[PDB]
Amino acid sequence: NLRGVMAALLTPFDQQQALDKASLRRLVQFNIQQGIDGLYVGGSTGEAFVQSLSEREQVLEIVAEEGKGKIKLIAHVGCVTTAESQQLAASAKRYGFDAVSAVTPFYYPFSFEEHCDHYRAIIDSADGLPMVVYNIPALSGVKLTLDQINTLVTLPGVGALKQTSGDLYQMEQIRREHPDLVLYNGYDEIFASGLLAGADGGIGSTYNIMGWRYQGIVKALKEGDIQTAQKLQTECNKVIDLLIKTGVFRGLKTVLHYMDVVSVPLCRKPFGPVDEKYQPELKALAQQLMQ
Amino acid sequence: NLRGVMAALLTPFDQQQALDKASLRRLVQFNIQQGIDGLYVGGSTGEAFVQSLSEREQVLEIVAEEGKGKIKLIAHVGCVTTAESQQLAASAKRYGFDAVSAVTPFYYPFSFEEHCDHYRAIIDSADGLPMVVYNIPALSGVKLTLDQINTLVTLPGVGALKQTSGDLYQMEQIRREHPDLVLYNGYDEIFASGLLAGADGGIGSTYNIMGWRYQGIVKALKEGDIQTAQKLQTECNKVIDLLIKTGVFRGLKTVLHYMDVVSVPLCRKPFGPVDEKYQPELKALAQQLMQ
Amino acid sequence: NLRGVMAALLTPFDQQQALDKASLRRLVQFNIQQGIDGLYVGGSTGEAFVQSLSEREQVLEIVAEEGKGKIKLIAHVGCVTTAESQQLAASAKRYGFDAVSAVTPFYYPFSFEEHCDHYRAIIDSADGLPMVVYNIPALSGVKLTLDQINTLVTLPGVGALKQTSGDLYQMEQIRREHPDLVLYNGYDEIFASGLLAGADGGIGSTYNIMGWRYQGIVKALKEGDIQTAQKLQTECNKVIDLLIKTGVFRGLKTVLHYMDVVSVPLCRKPFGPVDEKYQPELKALAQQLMQ
Amino acid sequence: NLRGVMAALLTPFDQQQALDKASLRRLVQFNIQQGIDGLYVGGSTGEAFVQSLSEREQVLEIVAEEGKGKIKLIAHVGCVTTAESQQLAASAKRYGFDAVSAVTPFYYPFSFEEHCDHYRAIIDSADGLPMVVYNIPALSGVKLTLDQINTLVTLPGVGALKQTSGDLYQMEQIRREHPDLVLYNGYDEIFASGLLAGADGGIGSTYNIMGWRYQGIVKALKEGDIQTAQKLQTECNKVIDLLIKTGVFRGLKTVLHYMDVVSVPLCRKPFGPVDEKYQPELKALAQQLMQ
């Protein structure tokens, strides 16, 4: 039942790179008002890999306060370490999330076997919340086969899969093998094609600023209005071109700033600031998005 | 006017692995009768890189004889040699094909300038026929930037682009920059998602045995009937699943053999024979495709 | 003067997966006694990416306690966060390490400028200790070009380069551009070839169990005995062949366990344990290394 | 006894892009006089993949005619087709070649079983002539594992391996497994390290203009003069640095032109010219290669 359009929450930092809590609550509220189905918290987009476990627990707790039962809450609880994820998995329950998630452990080369035990351990610590297996070869460098994906997605406790892959053949194969699985599209750029291939919904960072567009694409496809599904996608794509040039996280934070949601558009070092040349475009887009 | 669902044509060899002229013709006519929009001849699917120029020119002449005027005919004329490519391009004009096409020359690491001059030299020899730029990084090993792709797609005399890539963000990007461009989807497994992302047609190998499902998806999307564009794409993928186990060129030749179109389902060595274990499955496929 | 045969220190854990302090001191001392030039501490081998900052900081303290003034001591301070890296860089200075080192930040795609800034930021925090730029493309995913390596190596503060790469052409180009640069060979299996190509020392994990052999390779080549240099290199490769099968860190921790250096040969989950079939081979290896 | 330092011959063309037999004869003679142990004809360096069988068979003739008895002779006979390869294998024997060689067929993805079969067929047609497996992952994109290489290297009729990989751990596992095997180092830039890892000689393209330097490295390691072995390799590497700038084949033919050996220094298209700006240096290189 945790199927839908969900924003991969950005984590606002202040001038000295400390977590900015007011803008977090603010971004959460903004995201709710916009009409998004839920929030995926603490993932790549939430700059998790550049924060401590306690900073991560903090953000989890705050978005929980803010988000109770208004929307669906999902905690990316993953670290390279099983114990650390298990700790975050525990907090997630404590704070009342609806599920927990974890990237396939990166950097060190682990065996599929060790990946499966890792998921199992977290699911165990999640004490009840379903798991959302997180696939993203680009960043994790972990290449999974369809067989391995069938095995992972069948572990008891696993309730959904976040496909952050542009392979839409594999997308249809996964839907083919698992008709009832909540399969989420990870690349915003190909959202419409991912849904025609079998995704139920999607989790994305650009959902923070024009979430209604993606909600729009689903409506158009459900009604067979393909040309307007194509219109919304290309409009989303002209934004993604810009964001990729400016750097996605920082660029997103910038627009959100011009929308008076995020006090400081800073990402944490080693991320660098947005190039001044890009502001004109970013303010113009912040303005326009207030459509 | 190169828009359409066009079959990437297999070339039948006899028991002594020499060209089988009777089955080629049987295969041309089979396609024509299947209502395919046209044929792309002499490509990878055609085992072109395992034949001599003469053998290649021969199939050109034979399918022109059989096809000229009934359907659209594109000639894959590319070799690693520019000189040889030109020879085949001149013959394609001579034989009366509607366009000429060529893979980015592979094996040696040429430069993009080198690649541009290469297409220029052939376009020339094609003495009037539109060039179809054929992108297939997988097999060729050439990773073209979208900027690079724009330079080629706008090179004087170029009329289309065979996108054999699964990168569908890049599909919509090309469509966005070139709204009047004939863009063929190259990976059958994602045909429907390719069209949605931008392709206006496609050239694929599995069209030889089920060209109608592919033409059906085009219809279903035009209609706004996604549920059946999906039903059909999964019907195609179940086939592709099998074909990949057995070997796509030999498995297509086998299913077509059981369909009484091709005499010997042999590919040239180094390709090997279909594993007998799959013969009963392919036998079955041929049978049910006579639907 | 940070040239030499340096061991990449393993960090021993107990039954509960907590740092095993006693075994660590024992391991620090084993290396000292085996005659190694120094220790590189808190690296990949040291499972730094699977422990906390305080743990990492703990290990640095203890090894500085144990080995200060006895051998060269380089601290891997690296993290994804520049701020976390800065924290540990300041500690390394406080405990009295000789150099500070940092992997190119991973997971997120950072620009080369962002990488330079990252090193500058850490170098600043090291307040005087030189920096050993650590190039490990396979694990990190950061493909640096030679030019990029030339820039990073010329940054004020940088005194050495840890080339954990098998490209031995780039090894001599680096040596050719930088005659005074300390250039450590990162891949133990190619040690002898790496010294022939320009490396002047090396840092390696296997140095923990048979450091005396790489010392021999350095002696051999200096003395022009390529017969023993090859003799030792194949002997080392025979063990490496094994370790790769068993899993390198765990495999090495088991060998040291049978050498009575390490109490519990465990690695932190996600790593699984050594497979029972390797026990007799490792047991037998540990016994013959007592040579 | 086909252990040695073999030059991968260049194939000279005329202004018209046809063969300059006059210069080929001169090239063969120049390498002989240089002191090369043998010649490898019709490989990538001999622009074989941009030549017809007849042109390749013609080059096989003229050099057998010009160098039989004087030096060792190895005909590269590989084509993607087993048949075209077999045809050339037969001619190699006919013209009296010492050995035969074939690159792992490329472009279409073939299985290992298919590769083994291909080699057997060629081995069969060379009717007694030993086969030199030609491994070159970079240009062919065929990735063989150590086990696969072990199987190829033990196929009956196989006499040697041309290792065109910079993986010097693999070099030594091959030497370790097969102590009697003739192992040719394929990357000129790492020749000295390739030999210290296990190779007994090399087949390289830069040998045409400075083969003596490569003989000197063999002499150097033989005598345990690693210092002059290193001096020599950096001399070779500075040439390689430039050559990679100009384009290696075109650049080789140009210095050879300034050396009077090759009349016209063209490569066949798709290769373009040496950019005008390199002429001075290449001219200068040839000037100094008269050492």
Rounded Cα distance between A282 and C171, Å, is 44
D246-to-B101, C285, D275, D276 alpha-carbon distances in Å: 30, 51, 7, 10
Cβ partners under 8 Å of residue B158, min gap 6: B119, B123, B130, B131, B132, B133, B152
Residue D134 is among the residues annotated as catalytic for this protein:
yes
Are C207 and C196 contacting, i.e. CB atoms less than 8 angstroms apart?
Answer: no
Cβ partners under 8 Å of residue D146, min gap 6: D170, D173, D174
Identify the H or E element spanning D121: helix D112-125
Closest CA to D78 of D125, D112, D33, D36: D125
Question: Which residues of A83-140 form beta strands (DSSP E)?
Answer: 99-103, 131-135
Closest CA to D186 of D75, D73, D45, D92: D45
* Residue D254 token pair: 């140009």
Residue of A nearest to C136 (CA): A107
Closest CA to B236 of A172, D90, A3: A172
Question: Which amino acid is it at D28?
Answer: V
Three-class SS string for D42-107? Answer: CCCCCCHHHCCHHHHHHHHHHHHHHHCCCCEEEEECCCCCHHHHHHHHHHHHHCCCCEEEEECCCC
Question: Which residues of chain A form beta strands (DSSP E)?
Answer: 5-8, 38-41, 72-76, 99-103, 131-135, 158-163, 182-185, 201-204
In a 13 Å sphere around the CA of D143, the CA atoms on its Cβ side amount to 1
| A154 class by beta-carbon count within 10 Å (0-12 exposed, 13-18 middle, 19+ buried) | exposed
* Residue A249 token pair: 């996280």
Q: For chain C, list the contacting chains (3+ Cβ pairs, <8 Å).
A: A, D
Rounded Cα distance between D148 and B7, Å, is 36
Which residues are registered as beta bridge partners of D39? Answer: D7, D73
Rounded Cα distance between A202 and D287, Å, is 65
* Residue D130 token pair: 């030993």
Are B168 and B189 contacting, i.e. CB atoms less than 8 angstroms apart?
Answer: no
Rounded Cα distance between D219 and A273, Å, is 57
Give contacts of A 58-87 with C, CB under 8 A: 80-83
Closest CA to C274 of C257, C256, C254: C254
Closest CA to A212 of A147, A97, A290: A290
B103-to-B153, C130, D137 alpha-carbon distances in Å: 13, 51, 21
Rounded Cα distance between B114 and D272, Å, is 6
* Residue A239 token pair: 């934004």
Cβ partners under 8 Å of residue C222, min gap 6: none
Closest CA to D136 of D69, D64, D194, D186: D186
Any B CB within 8 A of A177 CB: no
Pairing of strands B131-135, B99-103: parallel
Question: Which amino acid is it at D199?
Answer: A
CATH of the domain at A122: 3.20.20.70
Instruction: Find where tokens 């004869």 sit.
Output: D25
CA distance C152 to chain D (A): 21
Q: How crowded is residue A1: how many other Cβ atoms within 10 Å of its Cβ?
A: 8
* Residue D220 token pair: 């150097």
Indicate the residue of D84, D105, D268 with minimum beta-carbon distance to B81: D268
Residue of B nearest to D114 (CA): B270
Rounded Cα distance between A186 and A218, Å, is 15
Identify the H or E element spanning A218: helix A207-222
Cβ partners under 8 Å of residue B197, min gap 6: A190, A192, A193, A233, B168, B169, B171, B172, B175
Rounded Cα distance between D16 and A11, Å, is 65
Q: Does chain B touch chain C (at least 3 C-beta pairs within 8 Å)?
A: no
A186 is in an annotated binding site: yes
List CB contacts (< 8 A) between C83 and chain A: 17, 268-269
Rounded Cα distance between C163 and C174, Å, is 10
Question: Which amino acid is it at A128?
Answer: G
| D103 class by beta-carbon count within 10 Å (0-12 exposed, 13-18 middle, 19+ buried) | buried
| A192 class by beta-carbon count within 10 Å (0-12 exposed, 13-18 middle, 19+ buried) | buried
Closest CA to B133 of B110, B156, B109, B111: B156
B174-to-A244, B67, B184, B185, D67 alpha-carbon distances in Å: 17, 31, 11, 12, 55
Q: In which domain, by residue range, is B84 found? A: 1-291
Closest CA to A59 of A107, A102, A9: A9
Phi, psi (deg, nearest 5) at residue B164: -100, 80
Asked if D193 and C189 come within 8 Å (Cβ–Cβ), the reply is no
List CB contacts (< 8 A) between A141 and chain C: 141
Which residues are registered as beta bridge partners of A6? Answer: A38, A203
Identify the H or E element spanning D196: helix D191-197
Cα–chain center distance at B64: 16
Percentages helix, strand, coil for chain D (3-state, rounded to 5) are: 50, 15, 35
Rounded Cα distance between D38 and D73, Å, is 5
CA distance A196 to chain C (A): 29
* Residue C59 token pair: 């290990």
Rounded Cα distance between C11 and C39, Å, is 12
Cα–chain center distance at D42: 8
Identify the H or E element spanning C184: strand C182-185
Three-class SS string for chain B? Answer: CCCCEEEECCCCECCCCCECHHHHHHHHHHHHHHCCCEEEECCCCCCHHHCCHHHHHHHHHHHHHHHECCEEEEEECCCCCHHHHHHHHHHHHHHCCCEEEEECCCCCCCCHHHHHHHHHHHHHHCCCCCEEEEECHHHHCCCCCHHHHHHHHCCCCEEEEEECCCCHHHHHHHHHHCCCCEEEECCHHHHHHHHHHCCCEEEECCHHHHHHHHHHHHHHHHHCCHHHHHHHHHHHHHHHHHHHHHCHHHHHHHHHHHCCCCCCCCCCCCCCCCCHHHHHHHHHHHHHCCC
Number of H helices, E strands in chain C: 12, 8
Q: For chain A, list the contacting chains (3+ Cβ pairs, <8 Å).
A: B, C
List CB contacts (< 8 A) between D234 and chain C: 172, 176
CA distance A168 to chain B (A): 6
Closest CA to B195 of B224, B154, B238: B224
Asked if B169 and A226 come within 8 Å (Cβ–Cβ), the reply is no
A73-to-A70, A130, A181, C79 alpha-carbon distances in Å: 9, 12, 18, 29
Asked if A49 and C113 come within 8 Å (Cβ–Cβ), the reply is no
Are C255 and C12 contacting, i.e. CB atoms less than 8 angstroms apart?
Answer: no
Question: Which amino acid is it at C238?
Answer: K
Cα–chain center distance at A79: 15
Domain count, chain D: 1
Rounded Cα distance between A16 and A133, Å, is 34
Q: How was this structure determined?
A: X-ray
Are C218 and C242 contacting, i.e. CB atoms less than 8 angstroms apart?
Answer: no
Pairing of strands D72-76, B201-204: unpaired
Resolution to 1 decimal place, in Å: 2.2
Any A CB within 8 A of C271 CB: yes
Number of H helices, E strands in chain D: 12, 8
Rounded Cα distance between D184 and D214, Å, is 13
Verify cis geometry, omega within 30 degrees of 0, for the bond prior to C265.
no
Closest CA to A250 of A17, A5, A52: A17
Instruction: Find where tokens 């001191």 sit.
Output: C25
Closest CA to B72 of B198, B203, B247, B205: B203
Cβ partners under 8 Å of residue B80, min gap 6: B105, B106, B107, B108, D49, D50, D270
Asked if B168 and A193 come within 8 Å (Cβ–Cβ), the reply is yes
Cβ partners under 8 Å of residue B147, min gap 6: none
Rounded Cα distance between D126 and D98, Å, is 10
B237-to-A172, A175, C204 alpha-carbon distances in Å: 8, 12, 48
Any C CB within 8 A of A139 CB: yes
A11-to-A52, A250, C118, C135, D50 alpha-carbon distances in Å: 13, 11, 21, 30, 56
Closest CA to B192 of A172, C125, C212: A172
Are A77 and A100 contacting, i.e. CB atoms less than 8 angstroms apart?
Answer: yes
Rounded Cα distance between A134 and A146, Å, is 14
List CB contacts (< 8 A) between C193 and chain D: 168, 190, 193-194, 196-197
Dihedral, A191, A195, A200, A202 alpha carbons, nearest 10: -10
Q: Is A174 helix (H, G, I), strand (E, B) or coil?
A: helix
Verify cis geometry, omega within 30 degrees of 0, for the bond prior to D179.
no
Identify the H or E element spanning D168: helix D168-177
Rounded Cα distance between A247 and D270, Å, is 37
The DSSP code for D135 is: E
Are C80 and C106 contacting, i.e. CB atoms less than 8 angstroms apart?
Answer: yes
Rounded Cα distance between D237 and D189, Å, is 6
Q: B13-37: b or e for each residue (b if 16 or more CB lie within 10 Å)?
A: beeebebbeebbbbbbebbbebebb
Rounded Cα distance between B35 and A232, Å, is 34
Identify the H or E element spanning A210: helix A207-222
Which residues are registered as beta bridge partners of C133? Answer: C102, C161
Cβ partners under 8 Å of residue B270, min gap 6: D80, D81, D82, D105, D110, D114, D115, D117, D118
Are D270 and B114 contacting, i.e. CB atoms less than 8 angstroms apart?
Answer: yes
A244-to-A206, A238, C176, C200 alpha-carbon distances in Å: 11, 10, 37, 41
Phi, psi (deg, nearest 5) at residue C109: -80, 110
Rounded Cα distance between A255 and A243, Å, is 10
Q: C195-207: b or e for each residue (b if 16 or more CB lie within 10 Å)?
A: bbbbbbbbbbbbb
Identify the H or E element spanning D41: strand D38-41
Which of left, alpha, beta for B198 (phi over 0: left; psi -120 to 50: alpha)?
A: left
Instruction: Find where tokens 């290992």 sit.
Output: D112
The DSSP code for D200 is: S
Are C79 and C42 contacting, i.e. CB atoms less than 8 angstroms apart?
Answer: no
Are C126 and C162 contacting, i.e. CB atoms less than 8 angstroms apart?
Answer: no
The DSSP code for C190 is: G
* Residue C267 token pair: 């690695």
List CB contacts (< 8 A) between D113 and chain B: 272
**Known binding positions of C:** 44-45, 164, 186, 188-189, 205
The DSSP code for A98 is: S
Which residues are registered as beta bridge partners of A102? Answer: A133
